Structures are given as C-alpha cells and as structure tokens.
Short mmCIF file of C-alpha atoms in Angstrom, two decimals:
data_model
loop_
_atom_site.label_atom_id
_atom_site.label_comp_id
_atom_site.label_asym_id
_atom_site.label_seq_id
_atom_site.Cartn_x
_atom_site.Cartn_y
_atom_site.Cartn_z
CA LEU Y 11 0.00 0.00 0.00
CA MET Y 12 1.58 3.24 -1.23
CA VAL Y 13 -0.05 6.68 -1.30
CA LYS Y 14 1.40 9.79 -2.95
CA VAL Y 15 -0.34 13.17 -2.82
CA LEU Y 16 1.03 16.50 -4.08
CA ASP Y 17 4.55 15.25 -4.80
CA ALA Y 18 5.78 18.59 -6.17
CA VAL Y 19 4.13 21.98 -5.64
CA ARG Y 20 5.22 25.35 -6.98
CA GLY Y 21 3.59 28.76 -7.01
CA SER Y 22 1.51 29.19 -3.82
CA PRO Y 23 -1.74 27.21 -3.98
CA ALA Y 24 -4.30 27.26 -1.18
CA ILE Y 25 -4.96 23.63 -0.21
CA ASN Y 26 -7.17 21.63 2.16
CA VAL Y 27 -6.00 18.03 2.56
CA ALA Y 28 -7.61 15.17 4.48
CA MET Y 29 -6.09 11.70 4.35
CA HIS Y 30 -7.49 8.69 6.19
CA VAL Y 31 -5.96 5.21 6.07
CA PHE Y 32 -7.68 2.31 7.82
CA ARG Y 33 -6.66 -1.30 8.31
CA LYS Y 34 -7.81 -4.35 10.23
CA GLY Y 35 -26.83 0.23 27.16
CA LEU Y 36 -28.77 2.98 25.39
CA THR Y 37 -25.89 3.94 23.09
CA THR Y 38 -22.70 2.17 22.04
CA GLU Y 39 -20.37 3.34 19.27
CA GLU Y 40 -16.89 1.88 18.85
CA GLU Y 41 -13.84 2.42 16.65
CA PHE Y 42 -14.99 5.39 14.58
CA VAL Y 43 -13.70 8.71 13.26
CA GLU Y 44 -16.25 11.50 13.74
CA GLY Y 45 -15.87 15.00 12.41
CA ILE Y 46 -12.99 15.65 10.05
CA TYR Y 47 -13.61 19.16 8.69
CA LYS Y 48 -17.06 19.26 10.29
CA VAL Y 49 -18.89 22.58 10.70
CA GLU Y 50 -22.12 23.01 12.68
CA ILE Y 51 -23.99 26.31 12.88
CA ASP Y 52 -27.08 26.86 15.07
CA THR Y 53 -27.74 23.25 16.03
CA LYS Y 54 -30.28 22.44 18.75
CA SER Y 55 -31.29 19.33 20.67
CA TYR Y 56 -33.92 18.55 23.30
CA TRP Y 57 -34.21 15.53 25.60
CA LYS Y 58 -31.45 13.26 24.31
CA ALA Y 59 -31.09 9.86 26.01
CA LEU Y 60 -33.03 10.57 29.20
CA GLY Y 61 -32.11 7.12 30.49
CA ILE Y 62 -33.67 3.86 31.58
CA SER Y 63 -37.33 4.06 32.61
CA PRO Y 64 -38.12 7.80 32.67
CA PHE Y 65 -41.71 8.81 33.43
CA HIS Y 66 -42.50 5.18 34.14
CA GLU Y 67 -45.91 5.58 35.81
CA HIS Y 68 -48.61 8.27 35.99
CA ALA Y 69 -46.51 11.02 34.41
CA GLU Y 70 -48.08 14.33 33.37
CA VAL Y 71 -45.62 16.16 31.12
CA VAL Y 72 -46.07 19.48 29.31
CA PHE Y 73 -43.43 20.25 26.68
CA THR Y 74 -43.16 23.55 24.82
CA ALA Y 75 -40.29 24.58 22.56
CA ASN Y 76 -40.27 28.14 21.23
CA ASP Y 77 -37.68 29.40 18.74
CA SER Y 78 -37.79 32.95 17.44
CA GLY Y 79 -35.98 36.25 17.47
CA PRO Y 80 -33.88 38.30 15.09
CA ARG Y 81 -30.67 36.37 14.49
CA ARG Y 82 -28.17 36.77 11.66
CA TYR Y 83 -25.34 34.54 10.42
CA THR Y 84 -23.27 36.22 7.71
CA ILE Y 85 -20.44 34.04 6.39
CA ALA Y 86 -18.18 34.42 3.36
CA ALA Y 87 -16.01 31.59 2.04
CA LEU Y 88 -17.02 28.74 4.34
CA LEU Y 89 -14.73 25.73 3.75
CA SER Y 90 -13.65 27.47 0.54
CA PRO Y 91 -9.89 27.90 0.05
CA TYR Y 92 -9.04 30.62 -2.45
CA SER Y 93 -6.04 32.35 -4.00
CA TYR Y 94 -5.41 35.65 -5.80
CA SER Y 95 -8.98 36.61 -4.98
CA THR Y 96 -10.96 39.18 -3.00
CA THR Y 97 -13.45 38.45 -0.22
CA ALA Y 98 -15.43 41.24 1.42
CA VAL Y 99 -18.42 41.49 3.75
CA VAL Y 100 -19.66 45.09 3.58
CA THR Y 101 -22.63 46.22 5.66
CA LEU A 22 -2.55 -0.96 -4.20
CA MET A 23 -1.03 2.32 -5.40
CA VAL A 24 -2.72 5.74 -5.41
CA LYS A 25 -1.33 8.89 -7.02
CA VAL A 26 -3.13 12.24 -6.83
CA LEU A 27 -1.82 15.61 -8.04
CA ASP A 28 1.71 14.43 -8.81
CA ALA A 29 2.88 17.81 -10.13
CA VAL A 30 1.18 21.16 -9.54
CA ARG A 31 2.20 24.58 -10.84
CA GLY A 32 0.51 27.96 -10.80
CA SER A 33 -1.55 28.30 -7.60
CA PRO A 34 -4.77 26.27 -7.77
CA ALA A 35 -7.31 26.23 -4.95
CA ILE A 36 -7.90 22.59 -4.03
CA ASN A 37 -10.06 20.51 -1.67
CA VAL A 38 -8.83 16.92 -1.34
CA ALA A 39 -10.38 14.02 0.55
CA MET A 40 -8.81 10.57 0.36
CA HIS A 41 -10.14 7.51 2.16
CA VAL A 42 -8.55 4.05 1.98
CA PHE A 43 -10.22 1.11 3.70
CA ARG A 44 -9.13 -2.49 4.13
CA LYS A 45 -10.22 -5.59 6.01
CA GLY A 46 -29.20 -1.58 23.12
CA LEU A 47 -31.20 1.15 21.41
CA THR A 48 -28.35 2.20 19.10
CA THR A 49 -25.14 0.50 18.01
CA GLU A 50 -22.84 1.75 15.24
CA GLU A 51 -19.35 0.36 14.78
CA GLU A 52 -16.32 0.98 12.56
CA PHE A 53 -17.53 3.96 10.55
CA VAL A 54 -16.31 7.32 9.27
CA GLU A 55 -18.90 10.06 9.81
CA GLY A 56 -18.59 13.59 8.52
CA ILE A 57 -15.73 14.32 6.16
CA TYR A 58 -16.42 17.84 4.86
CA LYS A 59 -19.86 17.86 6.47
CA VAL A 60 -21.75 21.14 6.94
CA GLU A 61 -24.96 21.48 8.95
CA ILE A 62 -26.89 24.75 9.22
CA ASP A 63 -29.97 25.22 11.43
CA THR A 64 -30.57 21.58 12.35
CA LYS A 65 -33.08 20.69 15.06
CA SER A 66 -34.02 17.53 16.95
CA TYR A 67 -36.62 16.66 19.57
CA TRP A 68 -36.84 13.61 21.84
CA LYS A 69 -34.06 11.41 20.50
CA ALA A 70 -33.63 7.99 22.14
CA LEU A 71 -35.56 8.61 25.35
CA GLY A 72 -34.58 5.16 26.59
CA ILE A 73 -36.07 1.86 27.63
CA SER A 74 -39.73 1.99 28.69
CA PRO A 75 -40.58 5.71 28.81
CA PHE A 76 -44.18 6.65 29.61
CA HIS A 77 -44.90 2.99 30.27
CA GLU A 78 -48.31 3.32 31.97
CA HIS A 79 -51.05 5.96 32.21
CA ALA A 80 -49.01 8.76 30.66
CA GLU A 81 -50.64 12.06 29.68
CA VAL A 82 -48.23 13.97 27.43
CA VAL A 83 -48.74 17.30 25.68
CA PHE A 84 -46.14 18.16 23.04
CA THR A 85 -45.94 21.49 21.23
CA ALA A 86 -43.09 22.60 18.97
CA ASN A 87 -43.14 26.18 17.69
CA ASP A 88 -40.59 27.51 15.20
CA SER A 89 -40.77 31.09 13.96
CA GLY A 90 -39.02 34.41 14.03
CA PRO A 91 -36.97 36.54 11.66
CA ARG A 92 -33.73 34.66 11.01
CA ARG A 93 -31.26 35.15 8.17
CA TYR A 94 -28.40 32.99 6.89
CA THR A 95 -26.37 34.74 4.19
CA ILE A 96 -23.51 32.63 2.81
CA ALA A 97 -21.29 33.09 -0.22
CA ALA A 98 -19.07 30.32 -1.60
CA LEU A 99 -20.02 27.42 0.67
CA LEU A 100 -17.68 24.45 0.02
CA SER A 101 -16.66 26.26 -3.17
CA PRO A 102 -12.91 26.76 -3.68
CA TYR A 103 -12.11 29.53 -6.15
CA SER A 104 -9.15 31.34 -7.69
CA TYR A 105 -8.59 34.67 -9.44
CA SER A 106 -12.17 35.56 -8.58
CA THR A 107 -14.18 38.07 -6.55
CA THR A 108 -16.64 37.26 -3.77
CA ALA A 109 -18.66 39.98 -2.08
CA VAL A 110 -21.64 40.16 0.28
CA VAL A 111 -22.94 43.74 0.17
CA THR A 112 -25.92 44.78 2.29
CA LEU E 4 -5.08 -1.91 -8.39
CA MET E 5 -3.63 1.42 -9.55
CA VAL E 6 -5.38 4.80 -9.51
CA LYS E 7 -4.05 8.00 -11.08
CA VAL E 8 -5.91 11.32 -10.84
CA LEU E 9 -4.67 14.73 -12.01
CA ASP E 10 -1.12 13.62 -12.81
CA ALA E 11 -0.02 17.04 -14.10
CA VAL E 12 -1.78 20.35 -13.45
CA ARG E 13 -0.82 23.80 -14.71
CA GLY E 14 -2.57 27.15 -14.62
CA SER E 15 -4.62 27.42 -11.39
CA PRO E 16 -7.81 25.33 -11.58
CA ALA E 17 -10.33 25.21 -8.75
CA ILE E 18 -10.85 21.54 -7.87
CA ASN E 19 -12.96 19.39 -5.53
CA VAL E 20 -11.66 15.82 -5.26
CA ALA E 21 -13.15 12.86 -3.40
CA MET E 22 -11.52 9.44 -3.64
CA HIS E 23 -12.78 6.34 -1.87
CA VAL E 24 -11.14 2.92 -2.11
CA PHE E 25 -12.74 -0.08 -0.42
CA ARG E 26 -11.59 -3.67 -0.05
CA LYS E 27 -12.61 -6.81 1.80
CA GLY E 28 -31.56 -3.37 19.07
CA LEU E 29 -33.62 -0.65 17.40
CA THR E 30 -30.80 0.48 15.09
CA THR E 31 -27.57 -1.14 13.96
CA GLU E 32 -25.31 0.18 11.19
CA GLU E 33 -21.79 -1.14 10.70
CA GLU E 34 -18.79 -0.44 8.48
CA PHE E 35 -20.06 2.55 6.51
CA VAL E 36 -18.91 5.95 5.27
CA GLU E 37 -21.54 8.63 5.86
CA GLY E 38 -21.31 12.18 4.62
CA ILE E 39 -18.47 13.00 2.25
CA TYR E 40 -19.23 16.52 1.00
CA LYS E 41 -22.67 16.46 2.63
CA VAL E 42 -24.60 19.69 3.16
CA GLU E 43 -27.82 19.95 5.19
CA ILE E 44 -29.80 23.19 5.51
CA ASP E 45 -32.87 23.57 7.75
CA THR E 46 -33.40 19.91 8.62
CA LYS E 47 -35.88 18.93 11.34
CA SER E 48 -36.75 15.74 13.18
CA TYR E 49 -39.33 14.79 15.81
CA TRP E 50 -39.48 11.70 18.04
CA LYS E 51 -36.66 9.57 16.65
CA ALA E 52 -36.16 6.13 18.24
CA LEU E 53 -38.09 6.68 21.47
CA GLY E 54 -37.04 3.23 22.65
CA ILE E 55 -38.47 -0.11 23.67
CA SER E 56 -42.12 -0.06 24.74
CA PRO E 57 -43.03 3.64 24.92
CA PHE E 58 -46.65 4.51 25.75
CA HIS E 59 -47.30 0.83 26.37
CA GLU E 60 -50.70 1.07 28.08
CA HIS E 61 -53.49 3.66 28.38
CA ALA E 62 -51.51 6.52 26.85
CA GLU E 63 -53.20 9.80 25.93
CA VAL E 64 -50.84 11.78 23.69
CA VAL E 65 -51.42 15.13 21.99
CA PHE E 66 -48.85 16.06 19.35
CA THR E 67 -48.72 19.42 17.58
CA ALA E 68 -45.91 20.61 15.32
CA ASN E 69 -46.02 24.21 14.09
CA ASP E 70 -43.51 25.63 11.61
CA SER E 71 -43.76 29.21 10.41
CA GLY E 72 -42.07 32.57 10.52
CA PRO E 73 -40.07 34.76 8.17
CA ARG E 74 -36.80 32.95 7.48
CA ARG E 75 -34.35 33.52 4.63
CA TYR E 76 -31.47 31.42 3.30
CA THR E 77 -29.48 33.25 0.61
CA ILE E 78 -26.60 31.21 -0.80
CA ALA E 79 -24.40 31.75 -3.85
CA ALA E 80 -22.14 29.04 -5.27
CA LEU E 81 -23.02 26.09 -3.04
CA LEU E 82 -20.64 23.18 -3.74
CA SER E 83 -19.66 25.05 -6.91
CA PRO E 84 -15.93 25.62 -7.43
CA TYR E 85 -15.19 28.43 -9.87
CA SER E 86 -12.28 30.31 -11.40
CA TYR E 87 -11.78 33.68 -13.11
CA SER E 88 -15.38 34.50 -12.22
CA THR E 89 -17.42 36.94 -10.15
CA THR E 90 -19.85 36.05 -7.36
CA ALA E 91 -21.90 38.72 -5.62
CA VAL E 92 -24.87 38.80 -3.25
CA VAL E 93 -26.24 42.36 -3.30
CA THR E 94 -29.22 43.32 -1.15
CA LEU Z 12 2.52 0.98 4.19
CA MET Z 13 4.16 4.17 2.92
CA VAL Z 14 2.58 7.64 2.79
CA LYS Z 15 4.10 10.70 1.11
CA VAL Z 16 2.41 14.11 1.18
CA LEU Z 17 3.85 17.40 -0.12
CA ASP Z 18 7.35 16.08 -0.80
CA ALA Z 19 8.65 19.38 -2.21
CA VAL Z 20 7.04 22.80 -1.74
CA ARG Z 21 8.20 26.14 -3.12
CA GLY Z 22 6.62 29.58 -3.20
CA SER Z 23 4.54 30.08 -0.03
CA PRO Z 24 1.25 28.15 -0.19
CA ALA Z 25 -1.32 28.28 2.60
CA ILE Z 26 -2.04 24.69 3.62
CA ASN Z 27 -4.30 22.76 6.01
CA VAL Z 28 -3.19 19.14 6.45
CA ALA Z 29 -4.86 16.34 8.41
CA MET Z 30 -3.40 12.83 8.34
CA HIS Z 31 -4.86 9.88 10.21
CA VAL Z 32 -3.39 6.37 10.15
CA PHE Z 33 -5.17 3.53 11.93
CA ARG Z 34 -4.21 -0.09 12.48
CA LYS Z 35 -5.42 -3.10 14.44
CA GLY Z 36 -24.46 2.04 31.18
CA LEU Z 37 -26.34 4.79 29.36
CA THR Z 38 -23.44 5.68 27.06
CA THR Z 39 -20.27 3.84 26.06
CA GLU Z 40 -17.90 4.93 23.28
CA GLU Z 41 -14.45 3.41 22.91
CA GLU Z 42 -11.38 3.86 20.72
CA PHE Z 43 -12.46 6.82 18.60
CA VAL Z 44 -11.11 10.11 17.25
CA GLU Z 45 -13.62 12.94 17.67
CA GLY Z 46 -13.18 16.42 16.29
CA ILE Z 47 -10.27 16.99 13.94
CA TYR Z 48 -10.82 20.49 12.53
CA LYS Z 49 -14.28 20.67 14.10
CA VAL Z 50 -16.06 24.02 14.45
CA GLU Z 51 -19.29 24.53 16.40
CA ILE Z 52 -21.11 27.87 16.56
CA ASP Z 53 -24.19 28.50 18.71
CA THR Z 54 -24.92 24.91 19.73
CA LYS Z 55 -27.49 24.18 22.44
CA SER Z 56 -28.56 21.12 24.40
CA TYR Z 57 -31.22 20.42 27.02
CA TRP Z 58 -31.58 17.44 29.37
CA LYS Z 59 -28.85 15.11 28.12
CA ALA Z 60 -28.55 11.73 29.87
CA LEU Z 61 -30.50 12.51 33.03
CA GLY Z 62 -29.65 9.06 34.38
CA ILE Z 63 -31.27 5.84 35.50
CA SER Z 64 -34.93 6.13 36.51
CA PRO Z 65 -35.65 9.87 36.51
CA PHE Z 66 -39.23 10.96 37.24
CA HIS Z 67 -40.08 7.35 38.00
CA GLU Z 68 -43.50 7.83 39.64
CA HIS Z 69 -46.15 10.57 39.77
CA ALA Z 70 -44.00 13.26 38.16
CA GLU Z 71 -45.51 16.58 37.07
CA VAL Z 72 -43.01 18.34 34.80
CA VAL Z 73 -43.39 21.64 32.95
CA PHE Z 74 -40.73 22.32 30.32
CA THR Z 75 -40.39 25.60 28.41
CA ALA Z 76 -37.48 26.54 26.15
CA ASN Z 77 -37.39 30.08 24.78
CA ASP Z 78 -34.77 31.26 22.28
CA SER Z 79 -34.82 34.80 20.93
CA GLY Z 80 -32.95 38.07 20.93
CA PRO Z 81 -30.81 40.05 18.53
CA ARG Z 82 -27.62 38.05 17.98
CA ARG Z 83 -25.10 38.37 15.15
CA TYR Z 84 -22.31 36.08 13.97
CA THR Z 85 -20.19 37.68 11.24
CA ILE Z 86 -17.39 35.44 9.97
CA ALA Z 87 -15.11 35.74 6.95
CA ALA Z 88 -12.97 32.86 5.69
CA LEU Z 89 -14.05 30.06 8.02
CA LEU Z 90 -11.80 27.00 7.49
CA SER Z 91 -10.68 28.68 4.26
CA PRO Z 92 -6.91 29.03 3.79
CA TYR Z 93 -5.99 31.70 1.25
CA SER Z 94 -2.96 33.36 -0.30
CA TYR Z 95 -2.26 36.63 -2.15
CA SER Z 96 -5.82 37.66 -1.36
CA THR Z 97 -7.77 40.29 0.57
CA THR Z 98 -10.29 39.64 3.34
CA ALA Z 99 -12.23 42.48 4.93
CA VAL Z 100 -15.23 42.82 7.24
CA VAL Z 101 -16.41 46.44 7.01
CA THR Z 102 -19.37 47.64 9.06
CA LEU K 14 5.05 1.99 8.40
CA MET K 15 6.75 5.14 7.10
CA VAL K 16 5.23 8.62 6.91
CA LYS K 17 6.81 11.63 5.20
CA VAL K 18 5.17 15.07 5.21
CA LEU K 19 6.68 18.32 3.88
CA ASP K 20 10.15 16.93 3.23
CA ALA K 21 11.52 20.19 1.78
CA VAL K 22 9.97 23.64 2.20
CA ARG K 23 11.19 26.94 0.78
CA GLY K 24 9.67 30.40 0.64
CA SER K 25 7.57 30.99 3.79
CA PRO K 26 4.26 29.12 3.64
CA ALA K 27 1.67 29.33 6.41
CA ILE K 28 0.88 25.75 7.47
CA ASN K 29 -1.42 23.90 9.87
CA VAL K 30 -0.38 20.27 10.38
CA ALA K 31 -2.10 17.53 12.36
CA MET K 32 -0.70 14.00 12.35
CA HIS K 33 -2.22 11.09 14.26
CA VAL K 34 -0.80 7.56 14.25
CA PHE K 35 -2.64 4.78 16.06
CA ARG K 36 -1.75 1.15 16.66
CA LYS K 37 -3.02 -1.81 18.66
CA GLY K 38 -22.07 3.88 35.21
CA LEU K 39 -23.89 6.63 33.35
CA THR K 40 -20.96 7.44 31.05
CA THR K 41 -17.82 5.54 30.09
CA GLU K 42 -15.41 6.54 27.32
CA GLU K 43 -11.99 4.96 26.99
CA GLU K 44 -8.89 5.34 24.81
CA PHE K 45 -9.92 8.28 22.64
CA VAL K 46 -8.51 11.52 21.25
CA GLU K 47 -10.96 14.40 21.62
CA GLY K 48 -10.46 17.85 20.19
CA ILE K 49 -7.53 18.34 17.85
CA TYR K 50 -8.01 21.83 16.39
CA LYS K 51 -11.48 22.09 17.93
CA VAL K 52 -13.20 25.47 18.23
CA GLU K 53 -16.43 26.06 20.15
CA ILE K 54 -18.20 29.43 20.25
CA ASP K 55 -21.29 30.15 22.38
CA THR K 56 -22.08 26.59 23.44
CA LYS K 57 -24.68 25.94 26.14
CA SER K 58 -25.81 22.92 28.14
CA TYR K 59 -28.50 22.30 30.75
CA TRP K 60 -28.91 19.36 33.14
CA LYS K 61 -26.22 16.97 31.94
CA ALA K 62 -25.99 13.61 33.74
CA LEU K 63 -27.94 14.47 36.88
CA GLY K 64 -27.16 11.03 38.28
CA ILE K 65 -28.83 7.85 39.44
CA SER K 66 -32.50 8.21 40.42
CA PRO K 67 -33.16 11.97 40.37
CA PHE K 68 -36.72 13.12 41.06
CA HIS K 69 -37.64 9.53 41.86
CA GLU K 70 -41.05 10.10 43.47
CA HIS K 71 -43.66 12.88 43.55
CA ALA K 72 -41.45 15.51 41.92
CA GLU K 73 -42.90 18.84 40.77
CA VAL K 74 -40.36 20.52 38.49
CA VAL K 75 -40.67 23.80 36.59
CA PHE K 76 -37.99 24.41 33.97
CA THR K 77 -37.59 27.65 32.02
CA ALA K 78 -34.65 28.51 29.77
CA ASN K 79 -34.50 32.03 28.34
CA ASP K 80 -31.84 33.13 25.84
CA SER K 81 -31.82 36.65 24.44
CA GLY K 82 -29.90 39.89 24.41
CA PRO K 83 -27.71 41.80 21.99
CA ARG K 84 -24.56 39.74 21.48
CA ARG K 85 -22.02 39.98 18.67
CA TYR K 86 -19.25 37.62 17.54
CA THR K 87 -17.09 39.16 14.80
CA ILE K 88 -14.32 36.85 13.58
CA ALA K 89 -12.02 37.07 10.57
CA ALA K 90 -9.92 34.13 9.36
CA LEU K 91 -11.05 31.39 11.72
CA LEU K 92 -8.86 28.28 11.25
CA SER K 93 -7.69 29.90 8.00
CA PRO K 94 -3.91 30.19 7.55
CA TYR K 95 -2.94 32.80 4.98
CA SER K 96 0.13 34.39 3.42
CA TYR K 97 0.90 37.61 1.53
CA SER K 98 -2.65 38.72 2.29
CA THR K 99 -4.57 41.40 4.17
CA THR K 100 -7.11 40.84 6.93
CA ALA K 101 -9.02 43.74 8.47
CA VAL K 102 -12.02 44.16 10.76
CA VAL K 103 -13.14 47.79 10.47
CA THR K 104 -16.10 49.07 12.49
#
C-alpha cells in the first residue's frame, strides 16, 4: 500500500488536505472517526437519552419549545480555500 | 494498491482533497467514518432515544413545537474553492 | 489496483476531489462511510427512536408541530468551485 | 505501508493538512477520534442523559425553552486558507 | 510503516499540520482523542448527567430557559492560515 499526494508543488496554492488510512446500554459506538472538517452552525437538541425508565408511571408532562428572534449569520467563504482573490463582507 | 493524486502542480490552484482508503441496546454503530467535509446549518431535533420503557403506563403527554421568528443565513461560496475571482456580500 | 488522478496540473484550476477505495436493538449500522461533502440546511426531526415499549398502556398523547415565521437562506455558489469568475450577493 | 504528502514545496502556499493512520451504562464509546478540525457555533442542548430512573413515579413536569434576541455572527474565511488575497469585514 | 510530510519547504508558507498515528455507570469513554483543532463558540448545556435516580417520586419541576440579548461575535480568518494577504475588521 503506497499513497502519494502532491509530490511537487510550486507557485503558492491554497490547499485543504484530508487523508485517512484504515486497516484491520442505550448507546454504544466503537472504533470510529467522527468530524474531520465538520462545521455546525445553530444546532439544537432537546431531551437526548433521558435514560432507563423515565416517566415510568402516571406522568403528566407538558413540553413547549419556542424558537424565534432576530438572528443573523453572515459568512463568506465557508470551507472554501481561495487564491489571488478578494473576499469582502460590507454592511 | 497504489494511489497517485496531483503528482505535479504549478501555478496556484485552490484545491479541496479528501482521500479515504479502507481495508479488512437502542443504538449501536461500529467501525464507521462520519462527517468528512460535512456542513450542517440550522438543524433541530426533539426527543431522540428517550430510553427503555418511557411513559410505560397511564401517561398524559402534551407536546408542542413552535418555530418562527426573523432569522437570516447569508452565505457566499459554501464548500466552493475559487481562484482569481471576486466574492462579495454587500448589504 | 492502480489509480491516477490529475497527474499534471498547470494554470490554477479550482478543484474538488473525493476518492474512496474499499476492499474486503432498534438500530444497527456497521462499516459505513456517511457524509463525504454532505450539506444539510434547515433539517428537522421529531421523536426519533423513542425506545423499547413507549406509551405501552393507556396513553393519551397530543402532538402538535407548528412551523412558520419569516426565514431567509441566501446562498451563492453552493458546492460550486469556480475560477476567473465573479460572485456577488447584493441586497 | 508508505505515505508521502507534499514532498517538495516552493513559493509560499497556505495549507491545512490532516493525516490519520489507523491499524489493528447509558453511554459507552471506545477507541475513537472525535473532532479533527471541528467548528461549532451557537450549539445548544437540554436534558442530556438525566440518568437511571428519573421521574419514575407521579412526576408533574413543565418544560419551556425560549430562544430569541438580537444576535449576530459575522465570519469571513471560516476553514478557508488563502494566499495573495484580501479579506475584509467592514461595518 | 513510514510517513513523510513536507520533506523540503522553501519560501515561507503558512501551514497547519495535524498527524495522528494509532496502533493496537452513566458514562464511560476509553482510549480516545478528543479535540484536535477544535473550536467552540457560544455553546450551552442544561442538566447533563444528573445522576442515578433523580426526582424519583412525587417531583414537581418547573424548567424555564431564556436566551436573548444583543450579542455579537465578529471573527475574521477562523482556522484559516494565509500568506501575503490582508485581513481587516473595520467598524
């Protein structure tokens, strides 16, 4: 097994490289690679893995999730390598 | 097994490379690669994997999910390598 | 098994490469590659994998999902490499 | 097993490299690599893994999640190496 | 097993390198690498792993989470090595 990437480079490129070589109870995950170059923006979660036997008997639950409001996410060149260029965010 | 990628490069390119080589209980996931160059924007989740035997007997549940509001997501060049170009977000 | 990609490059191209080589209980997934260059925008989920025996006996459940509101997602050049070009988002 | 990356470089490129070589109870995760080049912005979570037997009998729970307000996230060149370029955030 | 990265370099590049070589009870995680080049901005959490048997009998719980306010996060060149460039945040 031989891998060659970008043997010779000349003249200033913008590069993003990711190399992975592999060889060979509510939740159980084993022997994994999570999140190479992962981006998460405005992620939400409610009631994850409460456990064994929640609200087993005679439970009265009221759940209300409200999401609102003025929120802004201005992004230029996300995960976007560039060269000899111009990037501007003018407001 | 031999792999060659981008042996000779000249003149400043913008590149995104991803190489993967492989060889050989509510939830169970094993021996996986999750999220190479993954992007998530405004992801939501409710009541994931509450567990074994939730609300087993005589449960009175009221669920209400409300999503609203002024929200903006302005993105230029997502996962988009570029060269000798112009990117602008003018407001 | 021999793989050759982009042996010689000259003059600044914008490139997106993805190479994959392979060789050989509510949920169970094993030995997989999930999400190479995956993009998710405004994804929702409700009540995923509640578990074993939820609401087993005499359950009174009221479910209401409301989705509304002024929301904007302005994107230029998603997963779209470019060169010698112009990208603008003017508002 | 032999790996060669960027054997010869000349002329000032901007590079992001990630190399990974591998060889061979509510929650249990073993022998994993989490978060190489991971970015998280405005992530929320509620009631994660409350434990064994929460609210077992005669529980009266009121849950209310409110999210609002003027919030801004202005980012230029996220995970985006560049060279001979111009990046500006003018307000 | 032999690994070679950036054997010869000339002319002042800006580089980010990450190399990883591997060889071979509410929560239990063993033998892992968490957070190489990890960035977290404005992350929140509520009620994580309260323990064994919380609110076991006759519990009356009122939960209210409010998030609001004018907050700003202005970032230029996050995880974005650059060379011969210009970065400015003008307000």
